[PDB]
Design a protein around this ligand. Structure first.
Ligand code: NA
Length: 559
């Protein structure tokens, strides 16, 4: 009638043109003409094309290596089924359900999916094909450029959003990070606090633009959020934020940087504690499986308070080393509880070391271990001091969990009351060696050891003060060596109280030897052992007396 029912007729001729193209021997002029004309006709009836006809057309074009043309049709169809951009406003309004723009967005999404298939089949068809042959570009390369041209030449905004999402999906950080546009940044800023993977992209854009503080802000908020993020992923986020806030970002005050770097440092300290707990609890043989699943639920997520970590987990499982790390992170002012925790950690470790040495002695004698016991483990005082070192390096000795005035006497007490001395082949001064190497200043050691010797608290009583004197001798000796070394150092404090202390020490030894000579059952065997200590103490009082007397102010002078 009204010639020639144009929309429904053109769509048929276009299918006829495309069918003849695929029936060809691929002689370029005829194949290009049929393809080019088929695309010409389909575009004229873009707004009317049904999803079934569009799919079959694209697939036929894909089969004939007409990638750019297929993409161009899909974009044209998308723009024609929605010339008012009802889809762009429906996305810009949060995609409210119950709305009738969903239809307009879906008709575009069918076109965008088909564009994914074109590009997918493109990289597949040319998998292994070189981009250059003999110097100039191949045919397979020019079709890749021609296709991706059509993509970057578009002004469809819902399309470019759908392509950012698609690049993210496929993992092509290659091509997305390489976009100058802010349009992609702005698109990420709205969904950054919605998904981890999107936030990570946003932070990459910030960092490469030297906007480190803004990335540290995104990462920190993401770690404090209630999104489904694992604890370890929250450790990475905080660790990155801590680094990014520690460096200058232009336009932002030093105060604002430090306050964020400090919040990220504290939360990272708590997170590591929580991770150490969760790992240990899951691996613990003495924990029932039923409970472990419950622990994994409450600890492999957002970071918990230090109270909960202590009460509900660290204290229940007697992980006293992590209790001490918790008292450090919390600035916990309570000397008595701290020392109670130190006492439990020492005793727990001693019993565990004794148990492992027993199992060993059974292997070396032929016996059988208890069922389910994995078969020369360190002496108990060695494993104990390993525990003290691991904590000290993690807390740095500046903590309130290292009050040397209380902790050194306790460790010395353990050594006496458990025979961790010469009987088993240990250095009797091992407690002093430990705290010196850890970096306790020499003056503070002698100061404590003096208080141990004056107050005579058990076990430091009677003739066991012989051992206290030996510790003082060893500490002062190292102190003297340190002063002599520091004097030679500066060529290229000690008071009279140290001298008095060595005099009293000599008196204690004279008293112990006398008491030892009149003991019931026979004289003491340590006669010459004490005579040796007397000589050492006198030698140290001599050295200290020379330093105090002027030789310390003349250490940088040539002799
Ligand atoms: Na700054």
């Amino acid at each position: 009638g009204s010639f020639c029912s144009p929309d429904d007729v053109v769509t048929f001729k276009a299918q006829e043109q495309l069918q003849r193209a695929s029936e060809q021997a691929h002689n370029s002029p005829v194949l290009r003409a049929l393809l080019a004309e088929s695309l010409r006709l389909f575009e004229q009836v873009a707004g009317s094309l049904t999803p079934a006809n569009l799919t079959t057309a694209v697939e036929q074009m894909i089969s004939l290596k007409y990638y750019a043309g297929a993409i161009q049709l899909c974009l044209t169809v998308a723009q024609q089924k929605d010339r008012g951009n009802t889809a762009l406003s429906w996305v810009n309004d949060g995609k409210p359900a119950n709305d009738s723009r969903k239809k307009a967005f879906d008709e575009r999404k069918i076109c965008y999916n088909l564009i994914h298939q074109v590009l997918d089949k493109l990289e597949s068809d040319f998998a292994g094909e070189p981009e250059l042959v003999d110097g100039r570009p191949t045919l397979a390369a020019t079709k890749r450029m021609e296709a991706y041209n059509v993509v970057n030449d578009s002004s469809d905004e819902v399309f470019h959003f759908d392509m950012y999402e698609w690049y993210i999906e496929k993992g092509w950080t290659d091509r997305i990070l390489s976009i100058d546009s802010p349009h992609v940044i702005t698109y990420l800023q709205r969904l950054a606090e919605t998904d981890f993977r999107h936030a990570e992209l946003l932070c990459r854009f910030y960092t490469t633009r030297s906007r480190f503080f803004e990335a540290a802000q995104v990462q920190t908020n993401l770690a404090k959020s209630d999104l489904n993020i694992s604890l370890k992923d929250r450790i990475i986020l905080l660790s990155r934020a801590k680094g990014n806030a520690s460096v200058n970002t232009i336009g932002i005050s030093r105060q604002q940087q430090q306050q964020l770097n400090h919040e990220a440092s504290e939360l990272l300290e708590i997170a590591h504690i929580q991770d150490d707990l969760l790992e240990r609890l899951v691996a613990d043989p003495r924990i029932p499986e039923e409970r472990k699943a419950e622990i994994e639920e409450f600890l492999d997520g957002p970071i918990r308070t230090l109270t909960d970590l202590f009460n509900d987990y660290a204290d229940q499982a007697n992980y006293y080393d992590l209790c001490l790390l918790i008292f450090h992170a919390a600035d916990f002012h309570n000397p008595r509880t701290i020392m109670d925790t130190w006492n439990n950690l020492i005793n727990q470790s001693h019993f565990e070391a004794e148990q492992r040495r027993e199992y060993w002695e059974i292997v070396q004698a032929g016996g059988d271990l208890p069922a389910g016991v994995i078969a020369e483990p360190p002496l108990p005082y060695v494993y104990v001091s390993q525990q003290i070192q691991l904590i000290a390096h993690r807390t740095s000795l500046d903590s309130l969990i290292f009050p040397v005035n209380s902790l050194l006497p306790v460790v010395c007490a353990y050594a006496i009351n458990n025979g961790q001395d010469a009987s088993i082949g240990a250095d009797p001064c091992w407690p002093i060696q430990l705290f010196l190497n850890l970096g306790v200043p020499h003056a503070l050691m002698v100061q404590v050891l003096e208080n141990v010797l004056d107050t005579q608290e058990a076990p430091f009583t009677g003739r066991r003060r012989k051992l206290v004197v030996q510790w003082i001798a060893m500490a002062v000796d190292m102190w003297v060596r340190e002063v002599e070394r520091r004097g030679a150092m500066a060529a290229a404090v000690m008071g009279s109280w140290v001298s008095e202390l060595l005099g009293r020490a000599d008196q204690v030894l004279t008293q112990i030897a006398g008491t030892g000579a009149t003991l019931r059952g026979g004289a003491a065997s340590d006669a010459e052992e004490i005579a040796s200590l007397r000589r050492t103490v006198k030698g140290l009082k001599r050295s200290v007396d020379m330093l105090l007397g002027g030789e310390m102010a003349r250490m940088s002078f040539f002799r």
